[PDB]
């Protein structure tokens, strides 16, 4: 039960008590967003082709 690192100021205080010791790049993001946009475009083109038939 040891208290350590006691710091005090006018606003309050803090301390520690111990009881016992023991990324995707910009281009890759753009690639994924554009890949999904192209899958949307392909699906919509299939719908428009279906409607054209």
């Amino acid at each position: 039960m040891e208290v350590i690192e006691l710091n005090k100021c006018t606003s309050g205080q803090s301390f520690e008590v111990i009881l016992k010791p023991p990324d995707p790049s910009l281009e890759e993001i753009q690639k994924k967003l554009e890949a999904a946009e192209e899958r949307r475009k392909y699906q919509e083109a299939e719908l428009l082709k279906h409607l054209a038939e």
Binding site: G12, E16, K20
Partner: protein, 439 residues
């Protein structure tokens, strides 16, 4: 002094952000017009509250915040609300129509068209910072914007601000206050994509806030307004160390240093006490021992789970009000001899304690009574994995039938992202088990 930029995404993020900045203004003595009489340095300074507020030459104190939603009805409430004079129009970003509770619509379809605009409005705030710490991101798991657009934003923030810390406040989905059914999908999808980009995330389960409001505030049917004012109190106690003089959690990095030994396991459990009804005419004020003991009651946790059947990696005690170290240690000593508090073997069994002498501030006309002392406990316990297990099971039920999957595929998402995200959650669940359970 090092600035922090808050980002509020989607309805849940915006409304909670609105609740928080209202409370911040009350705590710092900032009037709705932005003026702050106690601030004697006009148009500048590097006080602790300047981490969250910039200053104009006219003496207005402006939140370092951006609000982004894919439809305008929620942010229009900010534009016309009590604190409308606080924010500049460029801080409030609204789209035309929303993501329809569809992660793929928020991440890919609509996110691609608005991400560059959001980054430019964020960059404008960063340019006013002499030493930017990083970002606090508020959002729901279940919404199409809160899940889909947040994960895209977090990815780009890691590109544009690689050194900066990013903290999340995430609303975990609860059927009691939701009319959606696809939220388990959106939660798993956004957790998978955001996991590597978030340094520390505080999950709030609407189920827990709802029941606390029912049980402790005697509100029969809590509204979002009830929930958000309670959530903003917890958020304020977590961010108070960034906004006031102190020596614990004084910058965002310290949150990871004190609460997250292993990067993927970065979801600390928050517990708050006391929550007292303002309508309660007669109330006896609770002691340091009583509010500290209440931090180990599951009924006061932001996520319902049983820490007795997990292990702790870190524990932080954040007090506000009439609290001195002597009473804290006397309370902790008693609690050890009565509670199941087991740490992992490779961590010290201890508590980092922070005390701010100013008692909690409550909104005039709110549901919460003023108390002489309160505490928020932040503990990294493996018991929070119970919340992942609940979510992953609901995901598994629907995904085995591919229910609702066509909505996501129809927005350009591939089906393999579902299983890739689910396998990542399976690994996350396994990580919690390896840390917290014996053979």
């Amino acid at each position: 002094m090092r600035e922090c930029i808050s980002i509020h995404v989607g309805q849940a993020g915006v409304q909670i952000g609105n609740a928080c900045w209202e409370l911040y203004c009350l705590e710092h003595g900032i009037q709705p017009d932005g003026q702050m009489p106690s601030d004697k340095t006009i148009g500048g300074g590097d006080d602790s509250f300047n981490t969250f507020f910039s200053e104009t030459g006219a003496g207005k104190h402006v939140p370092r915040a951006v609000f982004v939603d894919l439809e305008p009805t929620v942010i229009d409430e900010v534009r016309t609300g009590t604190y409308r004079q606080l924010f500049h129009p460029e801080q409030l970003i609204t789209g035309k129509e929303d993501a329809a509770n569809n992660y793929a619509r928020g991440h890919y379809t609509i996110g691609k068209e608005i991400i560059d605009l959001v980054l430019d409005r964020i960059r404008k705030l960063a340019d006013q910072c002499t030493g930017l710490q990083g970002f606090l991101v508020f959002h729901s798991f279940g919404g199409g914007t809160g899940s889909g657009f947040t994960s895209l934003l977090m990815e780009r923030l890691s590109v544009d601000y690689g050194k900066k810390s990013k903290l999340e406040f995430s609303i975990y989905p609860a059927p009691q206050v939701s009319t959606a059914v696809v939220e388990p999908y959106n939660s798993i999808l956004t957790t998978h994509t955001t996991l590597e980009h978030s340094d520390c995330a505080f999950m709030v389960d609407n189920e827990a806030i709802y029941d606390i409001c029912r049980r402790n505030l005697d509100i029969e049917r809590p509204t979002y307004t009830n929930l958000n004012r309670l959530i903003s109190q917890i958020v304020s106690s977590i961010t108070a160390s960034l906004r006031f003089d102190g020596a614990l959690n004084v910058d965002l990095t310290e949150f990871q240093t004190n609460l997250v030994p292993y990067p993927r396991i970065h979801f600390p459990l928050a517990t708050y006490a006391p929550v007292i009804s303002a309508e309660k005419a007669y109330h006896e004020q609770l002691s340091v021992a009583e509010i500290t003991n209440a931090c180990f009651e599951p009924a006061n946790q932001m996520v319902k789970c049983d820490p007795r059947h997990g292990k702790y990696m870190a524990c932080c005690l954040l007090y506000r009000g009439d609290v001195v170290p002597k009473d804290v240690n006397a309370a902790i000593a008693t609690i050890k001899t009565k509670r199941s508090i087991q740490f992992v073997d490779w961590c010290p069994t201890g508590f980092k304690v922070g005390i701010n002498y100013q008692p909690p501030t409550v909104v005039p006309g709110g549901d919460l009574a003023k108390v002489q002392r309160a505490v928020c406990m932040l503990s990294n316990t493996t018991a929070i994995a119970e919340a992942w297990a609940r979510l992953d099971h609901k995901f598994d039920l629907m995904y085995a039938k591919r229910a609702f999957v066509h909505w996501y595929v129809g927005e350009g998402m591939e089906e393999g992202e579902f299983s890739e995200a689910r396998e990542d959650m399976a690994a996350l669940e396994k990580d919690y088990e390896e840390v917290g359970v014996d053979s």
